[PDB]
């Protein structure tokens, strides 16, 4: 029979397994599935580790998530259309859950599906090669439980390895002289390490916003964020300064493009990530900056030069979980021969139309509107449950409004489920005072 | 020549392998085409310092484990090249325990003189090495991070020089997920100043624990705790350094030891050693071993017995370092060039097994560096690598061990004689404990 390799058991790989299991329970014959995951358990980013740098096997540490992390968007925007918050939790819960609560949710769906049996944990993907002679892929992996490098042949491969794990880590003048810690956002674990300290954040996006907010919340003496082009422009607290870009450091001080300088204890590079696929040769390897429309992907998923190779979740994310579902359902239907692909020329013409639109986008609203339209096109082609994308866009609009009103209280707001219409209750504690990140403390 | 060699890495071992070939060429031999792949932007391996930790600018694991303020942990006289002396490089006597930048300068000096930088492709990560039975050649696949290109080339021989002190052994202890302080491996340690006024727990009882603890002490840590798995280090530690039996668990703030004691600690540094990790090799070529004086499956400690066109340099545990890699690289060179015909697989395994049986009996430090000295003597007797006085190096290791026992904080204040030139090292202008500036300029200057 047909054999599929699914690379990774984060949200995307979980979605890909669930997509196949959904087709099976509706009565379809599905291919043999094998999912390779280098971590010891599923959940991808959402599987928290104290580890940084390299794991116990020598593999790069995957997760970038830290203690005290909460949902940075409304949970109502990432709800599964086939497995609601109401089904999983059995009651209304607040709109910005801590990491452990969303990890519990995503695991709940695949626990229900029974798809853990397809997953080989502690197994790092080493190489994927396409064989023209057999029209099959050789997937080579390292099983760290047995310390064995082995290969198997697959008919199709679905890459679900994420793109927020391999850091973009630029050097600044004087880093070799600096007496304090220099780390990337990827390595950040515990805001308590920076209690009573002066922390410099290099960058102006989600990691700078939230790591700065955690350092503030857990008692940093001072936060400095520095921007390359434009300030973040939010209402920062009194002990948070925004500066133009870092120019250089010395033993103790950071020097900014405005000619100012001051003592800093630690530097956190919130400079984003690279798309990194060392297990792919250039015939299969996606090369892209982080963007809403990466190139060479028909419907954002099908590798145009070899359409038996698929990528899930490689777009920049406003939508996250239910985008990966729409993609996984699409990829499943292509694999199962339910969606015949057009010619390479027709695929490229379709992708180019989406690219041309992506190139014009300016505002946050234009961006989540584009991604909503993309997902609508995907769900129109499969049996993934329809959901109210314009209502989700309106929720993103409210969220963006709440961040502008007050960047420290946006998580104190509640939104309505677009799947069930359930209104989220207000949490028992305002975010700034909610020090305990535990599922037990949140659901109490 | 019509054959081509891939050398994986441009640390001391890969530099030695290039120098071995260049030495044969300047003496009038025809040598093979050489290609050396190095993922860093410059040569030196461990000795090339970086502020970076975890993953580098290209997403490759950061290689170097070296830190600010690192000095030679053995006498430089024990690692001197037999073909390129300290006297030749520096033009004067220098003290016996140079800072990192000074030994980096030295190792670079030899390959600068040799002109072998032209063979090296920097910023290039080795991804895969496969042996092809059909052509009896290796396909080496690499990622050139300068151009972001993955390409493959065919090689007749491969010499693996990628080290084994870079991929950390990082065991989890009960409660690590709860602990509110930093947890890092020795591999990630960069700057003792980060621990000034802090209580630092070191897990481990070998060189990394000794030296990282010594740096934390020197640069003003409040307290050092070192914990041992089997036996204490047993040195004369300063008053703010405690030795405990092994860590059992941690909570939010405290470390709990096997003696039933516990105390609040600010940071935990795992000084738990390293793993031999070769993700670019399939199991037919991949060395699997613990850190030891005699890793298995290596004839003369260098020739992969299942495929003797594949070689490993420097994969042994190290008393000897630079001149061991030279002895090995000269041997591998002579096998590649057909100067040393190999015995049958059965004869190679019988020779390796004799060395293994001896290795298994070793107990004392002296038995260990004596074994490694005898190993190196066997290698150098088979090639034109300049003979050097191995018993005199062993005697220097013995003096060094004696100096560490007398006073672990002042062993670096002693001087030894070059076994290559007979030059006596002068006393440094500053005692180690007060020598806060690690720069080559500060070390080679005359002012204290
Ligand atoms: C710090 C951080 C916070 C975030 N917070 C939110 C949030 O609040 N809300 C939200 O909607 N989204 C958030 N995201 C976005 C995040 O990308 C998605 O939520 C989701 O985790 C992406 O799922 P994925 O499966 O595509 O990738 P990942 O979650 O990265 O999972 C990829 C999986 O592939 C495995 N893998 C990778 N390489 C290999 C290999 N070679 N061999 C084997 N296995 C491999 C990994 O170990 C991992 O399990 C956050 C991202 C980051 C980095
Ligand atoms: C912290 C520390 C301190 C030390 N101090 C001393 C000392 O004072 N005295 C002493 O004698 N010895 C010391 N050593 C021992 C050390 O092993 C040797 O000095 C020497 O650096 C070993 O050289 P090598 O070339 O075998 O390996 P390395 O120095 O580790 O060099 C390996 C090279 O391979 C490259 N490489 C690795 N993987 C790849 C890949 N996939 N693709 C491409 N290139 C790759 C690396 O980037 C590097 O250039 C120390 C070791 C450590 C870890
Ligand atoms: N749940 C949470 O609270 C949380 C926390 C952290 C991250 N995340 C998630 O993680 C993902 C990644 O977010 P991210 O902000 O890490 O990455 P990102 O969105 O790709 O942000 C990249 C940032 O790096 C900056 N940058 C790049 N090079 C720079 C340089 N040389 N100097 C200064 N700044 C530089 C960019 O500035 P320019 O704009 O000038 O290019 C930009 O601000 C997102 O999905 C996010 O939601 C979530
Ligand atoms: N120039 C310098 O100053 C400097 C500094 C750092 C390192 N180095 C070099 O780096 C190399 C490696 O030295 P290293 O000490 O890092 O590694 P190493 O010699 O392999 O030592 C490993 C240590 O980890 C301990 N260990 C392993 N697992 C443990 C566990 N679960 N709990 C507690 N302890 C555990 C071992 O204890 P057991 O003995 O009980 O097994 C041993 O003490 C050497 O070449 C060294 O010279 C040099
Ligand atoms: Cl069907
Ligand atoms: Cl000012």
Numbering used by the authors:
A (entry chain B): 2 to 445
B (entry chain A): 1 to 448
Recite the paper's sentences.
Flavin-containing monooxygenases (FMOs, EC 1.14.13.8) are enzymes that insert one molecule of oxygen into organic substrates using the cofactors flavin adenine dinucleotide (FAD) and NAD(P)H (1–3). A subgroup of bacterial FMOs oxidize trimethylamine (TMA) to trimethylamine N-oxide (TMAO) and are often referred to as trimethylamine monooxygenases (Tmms). The mFMO enzyme forms a dimer, and each monomer consists of two domains: the larger FAD-binding domain and the smaller NADPH-binding domain. Upon binding, NADPH reduces the tightly bound FAD, thus generating the reactive flavin intermediate C4a-hydroperoxy-FAD and NADP+.
To make the flavin-containing monooxygenase (FMO) Methylophaga aminisulfidivorans trimethylamine monooxygenase (mFMO) more suitable for industrial application, we engineered it using the Protein Repair One-Stop Shop (PROSS) algorithm. The melting temperature (Tm) of native mFMO was measured to be 46.2°C, which is in line with the previously reported Tm of 46.7°C. All mFMO variants demonstrated increased temperature stability compared to that of the wild-type enzyme, as reflected by their Tm values, which ranged from 50.9°C for mFMO_28 to 55.2°C for mFMO_20. To understand the structural basis for the increased thermostability of mFMO_20, we crystallized it with the cofactors FAD and NADPH. The crystals were indexed in the C2221 space group and contained the biological dimer within the asymmetric unit, with one FAD and one NADP+ molecule bound per catalytic site. Interestingly, half of the mFMO_20 mutations are located in a 46-amino-acid subsequence (M353Q to L398K) of a region in the large domain containing three helices: α6 (K345 to T361), α7 (A365D to M382), and α8 (I390 to N406). Structural analysis revealed that five of these mutated residues form new salt bridges involving six native residues (K358R-D374, L360E-R356, A365D-K401, N378D-K300-D351, and L398K-E366), four of which form interhelical interactions, thus confirming the PROSS model predictions. Helices α6 and α7 are directly connected by K358R-D374 and indirectly connected, via the β18-β19 loop, by N378D-K300-D351. Helices α7 and α8 are connected by A365D-K401 and L398K-E366. Two new hydrogen bonds involving side chains are also introduced, one forming an intrahelical bond (α6; M353Q-R356) and the other an interhelical bond (α7-α8; T370D-N394). The lower B-factors observed near the entrance to the active site in our crystallographic analysis are consistent with the increased thermal and kinetic stability of this design.
